[PDB]
Amino acid sequence: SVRKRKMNRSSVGKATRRNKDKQRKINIQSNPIIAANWDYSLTMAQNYKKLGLRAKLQTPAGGKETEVVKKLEELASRSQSEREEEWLEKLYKKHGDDYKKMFFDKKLNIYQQSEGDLKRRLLRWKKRNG
Amino acid sequence: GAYKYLEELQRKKQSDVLRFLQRVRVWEYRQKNVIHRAARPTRPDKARRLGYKAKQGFVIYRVRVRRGRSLRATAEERVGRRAANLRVLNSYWVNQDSTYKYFEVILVDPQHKAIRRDARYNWICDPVHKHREARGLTATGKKSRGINKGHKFNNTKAGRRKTWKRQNTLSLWRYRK
Amino acid sequence: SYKKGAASNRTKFVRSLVREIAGLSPYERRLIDLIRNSGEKRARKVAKKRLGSFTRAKAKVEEMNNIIAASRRH
Amino acid sequence: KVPPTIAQFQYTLDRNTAAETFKLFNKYRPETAAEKKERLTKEAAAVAEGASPKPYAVKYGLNHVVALIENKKAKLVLIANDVDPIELVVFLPALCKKMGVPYAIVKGKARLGTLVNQKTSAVAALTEVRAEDEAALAKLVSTIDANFADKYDEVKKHW
Amino acid sequence: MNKQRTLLISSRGVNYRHRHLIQDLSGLLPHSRKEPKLDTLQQLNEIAELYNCNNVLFFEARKHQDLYLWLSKPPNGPTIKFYIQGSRPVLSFDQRFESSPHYQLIKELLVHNFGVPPNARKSKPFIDHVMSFSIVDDKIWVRTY
Amino acid sequence: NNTKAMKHALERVQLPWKKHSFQEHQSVTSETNTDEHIKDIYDDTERELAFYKQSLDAVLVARDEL
Amino acid sequence: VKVHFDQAGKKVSRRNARATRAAKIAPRPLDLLRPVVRAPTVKYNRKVRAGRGFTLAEVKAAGLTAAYARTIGIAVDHRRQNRNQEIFDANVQRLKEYQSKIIVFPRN
Amino acid sequence: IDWFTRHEEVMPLTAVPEPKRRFVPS
RNA sequence: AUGGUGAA
RNA sequence: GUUCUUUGUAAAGUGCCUUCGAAGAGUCGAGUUGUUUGGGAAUGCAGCUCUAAGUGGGUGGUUCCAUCUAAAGCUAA
RNA sequence: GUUUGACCUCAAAUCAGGUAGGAGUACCCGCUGAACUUAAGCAUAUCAAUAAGCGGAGGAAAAGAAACCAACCGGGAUUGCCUUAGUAACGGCGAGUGAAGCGGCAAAAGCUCAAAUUUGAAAUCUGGUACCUUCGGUGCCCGAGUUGUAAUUUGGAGAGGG
Numbered sequence A: 001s002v003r004k005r006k007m008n009r010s011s012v013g014k015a016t017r018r019n020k021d022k023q024r025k026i027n028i029q030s031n032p033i034i035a036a037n038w039d040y041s042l043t044m045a046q047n048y049k050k051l052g053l054r055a056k057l058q059t060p061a062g063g064k065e066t067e068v069v070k071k072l073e074e075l076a077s078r079s080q081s082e083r084e085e086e087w088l089e090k091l092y093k094k095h096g097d098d099y100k101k102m103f104f105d106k107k108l109n110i111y112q113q114s115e116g117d118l119k120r121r122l123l124r125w126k127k128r129n130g
Numbered sequence B: 001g002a003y004k005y006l007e008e009l010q011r012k013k014q015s016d017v018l019r020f021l022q023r024v025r026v027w028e029y030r031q032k033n034v035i036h037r038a039a040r041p042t043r044p045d046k047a048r049r050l051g052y053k054a055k056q057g058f059v060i061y062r063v064r065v066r067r068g069r070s071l072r073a074t075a076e077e078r079v080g081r082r083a084a085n086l087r088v089l090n091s092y093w094v095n096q097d098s099t100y101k102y103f104e105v106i107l108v109d110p111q112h113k114a115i116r117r118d119a120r121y122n123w124i125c126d127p128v129h130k131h132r133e134a135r136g137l138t139a140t141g142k143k144s145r146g147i148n149k150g151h152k153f154n155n156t157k158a159g160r161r162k163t164w165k166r167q168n169t170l171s172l173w174r175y176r177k
Numbered sequence C: 001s002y003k004k005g006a007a008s009n010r011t012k013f014v015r016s017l018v019r020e021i022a023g024l025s026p027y028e029r030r031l032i033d034l035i036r037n038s039g040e041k042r043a044r045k046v047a048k049k050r051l052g053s054f055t056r057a058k059a060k061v062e063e064m065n066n067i068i069a070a071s072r073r074h
Numbered sequence D: 001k002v003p004p005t006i007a008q009f010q011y012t013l014d015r016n017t018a019a020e021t022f023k024l025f026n027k028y029r030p031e032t033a034a035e036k037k038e039r040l041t042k043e044a045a046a047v048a049e050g051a052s053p054k055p056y057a058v059k060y061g062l063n064h065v066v067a068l069i070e071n072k073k074a075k076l077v078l079i080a081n082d083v084d085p086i087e088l089v090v091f092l093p094a095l096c097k098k099m100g101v102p103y104a105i106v107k108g109k110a111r112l113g114t115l116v117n118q119k120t121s122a123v124a125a126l127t128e129v130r131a132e133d134e135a136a137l138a139k140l141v142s143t144i145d146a147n148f149a150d151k152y153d154e155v156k157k158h159w
Numbered sequence E: 001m002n003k004q005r006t007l008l009i010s011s012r013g014v015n016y017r018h019r020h021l022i023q024d025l026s027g028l029l030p031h032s033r034k035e036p037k038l039d040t041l042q043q044l045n046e047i048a049e050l051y052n053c054n055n056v057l058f059f060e061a062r063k064h065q066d067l068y069l070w071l072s073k074p075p076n077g078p079t080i081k082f083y084i085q086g087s088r089p090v091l092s093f094d095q096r097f098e099s100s101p102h103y104q105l106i107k108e109l110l111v112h113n114f115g116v117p118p119n120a121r122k123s124k125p126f127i128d129h130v131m132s133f134s135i136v137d138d139k140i141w142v143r144t145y
Numbered sequence F: 001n002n003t004k005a006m007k008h009a010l011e012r013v014q015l016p017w018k019k020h021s022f023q024e025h026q027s028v029t030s031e032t033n034t035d036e037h038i039k040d041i042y043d044d045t046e047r048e049l050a051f052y053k054q055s056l057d058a059v060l061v062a063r064d065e066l
Numbered sequence G: 001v002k003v004h005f006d007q008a009g010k011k012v013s014r015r016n017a018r019a020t021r022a023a024k025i026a027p028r029p030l031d032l033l034r035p036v037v038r039a040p041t042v043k044y045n046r047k048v049r050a051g052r053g054f055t056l057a058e059v060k061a062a063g064l065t066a067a068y069a070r071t072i073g074i075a076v077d078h079r080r081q082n083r084n085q086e087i088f089d090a091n092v093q094r095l096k097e098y099q100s101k102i103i104v105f106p107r108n
Numbered sequence H: 001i002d003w004f005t006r007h008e009e010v011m012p013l014t015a016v017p018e019p020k021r022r023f024v025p026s
Numbered sequence I: 001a002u003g004g005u006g007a008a
Numbered sequence J: 001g002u003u004c005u006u007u008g009u010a011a012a013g014u015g016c017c018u019u020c021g022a023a024g025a026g027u028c029g030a031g032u033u034g035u036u037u038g039g040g041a042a043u044g045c046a047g048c049u050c051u052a053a054g055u056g057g058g059u060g061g062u063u064c065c066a067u068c069u070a071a072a073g074c075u076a077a
Numbered sequence K: 001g002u003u004u005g006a007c008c009u010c011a012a013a014u015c016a017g018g019u020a021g022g023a024g025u026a027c028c029c030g031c032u033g034a035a036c037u038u039a040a041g042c043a044u045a046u047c048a049a050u051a052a053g054c055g056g057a058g059g060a061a062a063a064g065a066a067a068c069c070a071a072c073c074g075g076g077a078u079u080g081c082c083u084u085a086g087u088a089a090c091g092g093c094g095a096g097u098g099a100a101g102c103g104g105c106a107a108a109a110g111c112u113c114a115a116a117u118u119u120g121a122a123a124u125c126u127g128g129u130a131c132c133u134u135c136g137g138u139g140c141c142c143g144a145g146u147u148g149u150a151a152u153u154u155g156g157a158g159a160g161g162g
Helices: A002-009 A032-036 A044-051 A068-076 A082-094 A099-104 A115-128 B003-009 B016-031 B044-048 B071-082 B113-117 B139-144 B160-167 C009-021 C026-050 C054-073 D015-025 D033-047 D062-068 D092-099 D109-114 D131-149 E016-028 E044-051 E101-112 F004-012 F046-065 G007-024 G056-062 G066-071 G085-101
Strands: B035-038 B058-066 B087-090 B093-096 B100-108 B171-173 D076-080 D103-106 D123-126 E008-010 E056-060 E068-072 E080-082 E088-092 E127-132 G002-004 G036-038 G048-050
Touching: A032 A068, A044 G007, A082 A115, A099 A115, B003 B044, B003 C009, B016 B058, B016 B093, B016 B100, B035 B071, B058 B071, B071 B087, B071 B100, B071 B139, C009 D092, C026 C054, C026 E044, C054 E044, D015 D076, D015 D103, D015 D123, D015 D131, D062 D092, D062 D123, D076 D092, D076 D109, D076 D131, D092 D103, D103 D131, E008 E016, E044 E056, E080 E101, E088 F046, E101 F004, E127 F046, G036 G085, G056 G066, G056 G085
Parallel strands: B171 G002, D076 D103, E008 E056, E088 E127
Antiparallel strands: B035 B058, B058 B100, B087 B100, B093 B100, D076 D123, E056 E068, E068 E080, G036 G048
């Protein structure tokens, strides 16, 4: 070759890259419980059977719980705004619990929300307050 | 809104109203250059349904081509050479004469920061779309390449040279078949 | 085709509105006169030659019949 | 030679009626970008520390106006004659005549732009009004229908 | 008395071999009417209403290798389906055509349809060729010399 | 396939050619040529010759009437 | 004249590709849960094969939603139709069994 | 000839419900 | 034959 | 893993009930002159002439039935 | 107002910020296109939807989420491999040319517009400039933009409310 002949001849050197070992021994990255329980001497499919978890959901072409309990372990384990709360205080002190009067009201209930909207937000308000 | 009324108005092309608009504009576009920039698309409903937003970075070039390879693709190719920084998106028919045909090809500036942002159009900035018209990747180019789905397009679906090279070169395995 | 293409009052309105505002194309301008003079027979002949198929020319001449009848009377 | 739906324009609204139309329309300016921004900072300074009805303005988008006529919500519709693609607005006088919404072809597109905080508008419409200008609006409707519509009943004809 | 017209019509999809047959027979028939295109059946009666044609030849096209020709009459014609694998003509026929109504009726059709009326629009006085009609193995064989 | 409606078709469709001249008919009914006697039906040898004779001898029936 | 010398090479390529996808998609089984489908044409109708995607109907009958189905790794097809009753039953049972097996981790 | 528009229109061309966004302040 | 270089 | 901040009558999702509900034209198609193919139902494309429809339109199967929704665009392996 | 002012259009500048050319070219995408040679002379078949030439890209390209294939107890984006198969089919049936659906596998991922009004408020973006935690954020000013920029929707429906 023309260009390769110069690169071998020059005193610049070549951008030598040794990256063939890393193409096989790939570290697991996305789960810490797996990161501890993964034998790199074994293959992909062999590591899955060792754990318990399925490696393939289809019937595979060709031929052929210590860890899974720890995954079930990690499976065992919103408020309202200041204006919204203060606005609900105005409605409750005015009417009480008359939602029909509350939604036919114009001065306090400006955005013409339904009975179901106002009462739901009042239930959340009655949890944080009286 | 109005785009339904315009859509239906553009159907009746030889009708009295649109007939008159043709004979005025055909005279007016002959006064101007071969390749020149229109400030706004004359058929804006068509511009939209071919992907034109009336924001900074979109350009509508009007182009003139001779009558009697396809003329739509030639129209796009002519503006590609003149406006090299731009990327051809789509083109459409506006008006025709006995001697000439006119197209209003729509372009996008990939360099303009209003296009490099929004994700609906920032795909055109990717270097794989340099001269879409020079490779027949526009609407009319893909039409002339015979690229659709069906029994009709069997010999020219995924590259007519690709299917030829596949069919007329011997393939041999390590353990022979 | 469950969503075949129902009447849609708006679309019918727009099509008939544009149908009059645009006017008439030169072949149709000839065609409507050809109905009144030479009858519906020769009208279907010219329309079939002008358009692609006869199935187009039927609905076309039928549309012209609706336009003429509704114009003069109402 | 002009086909009748073109040159239904150019037979526009006259001197005095157009002046009176803008005497009404200039009352109903949309709040400009600067005015709107300063109002919201006033709202920010007030409401963060310690009611209003719907304000009437002119409606000015082509899609918005073509919505409003046939809604039907438009009362007066102004239409510019000078439009770069004329075909954009040619159907619009016919649409107004069909739905029975009173319209007027105004002269000058930039003339519409002045009342609306834009360069050009092509179409402008007044959907609703304050109570004081209601009688004045309806009087202008009759004024426009007498001057524009009744004088040019033959505008649908003659090339 | 014999005043008739022929109407060669075709469905979407005709070329090489079939268009050789359509174009040459349209040339050989001086009273032929060459039409653009059709797509389906009930319409064909109204096609005859246009040109006042006394005959019709409809080329239907189905399974990619075969052929389906439809011959019929304008007012109340009984159609017969087929499956085959500009001078004044002379029309020869067969004994086994007259053996049954099945072949006698199609003989009548082949006389005035595929033949000629003497008062044709493009009728030439000089003669050139014959028309061979005969039956073998339940099917017809036609060659023009 | 019934022959009743076939004979009803012979009533309405068929034109009387015997009332008119051979000029108007122009059709030689080459009778007594059964053509089931033809040897080699799959080789196409006698099928060519017997049909060619059937066509050419039919001209001489029309030749006197011409 | 092409020769496939790289039959051994590209198997090692494909295996290492699966190994990377295993490393990056750590607890998940590399591929999506595909349906069970009856093959077309008289010749092959006796054969029952892996289909492309389920349906909105099969997903809805299983007890989950279409958009959510894809996030849990169920391939969903929208153009496929549920004409057959036995196929519909087999796929619904396949999903319900799959839903008993899955362990969807919390987002906290 | 202004033929179709002489018969003046009655109901609007749609039937769409108008949303609550066009009432309570925006 | 394709493409190029030279030329009283 | 470790924290610092999360707000606004904010942003969605799901089931039921109620009222509506627009989808690309000098394009589809038609005739013809060339090109494309081993293409028989000129396949595909281009040139030129004319040029549609909305309980629509395209493609296939023996009188119906099945199948998709063009004339806009993006996308790894 | 025989002033003046809106726009639209055409200009301008050694202004500010950019960008396009050329090289390489195995692969890919377009465009253009021979002849020696094969059947007997050569118009097709045949060299050949080749070579040369021209234009354009990238790490791949192209293709792609059906206006698809089918005729079945239906399949379901595209690409590639195995097979279908030297089969259907075409070819002075001859030099011969030569698919495709299904099936097995490789790899798998879907979505964005245009479409009917934010109209109780262009909710959007460019640029300049001032700072900041600078592949950017914020304030302020300017321009674009209603001949429509944002949010909401793309038939798998969807939206309005309850």
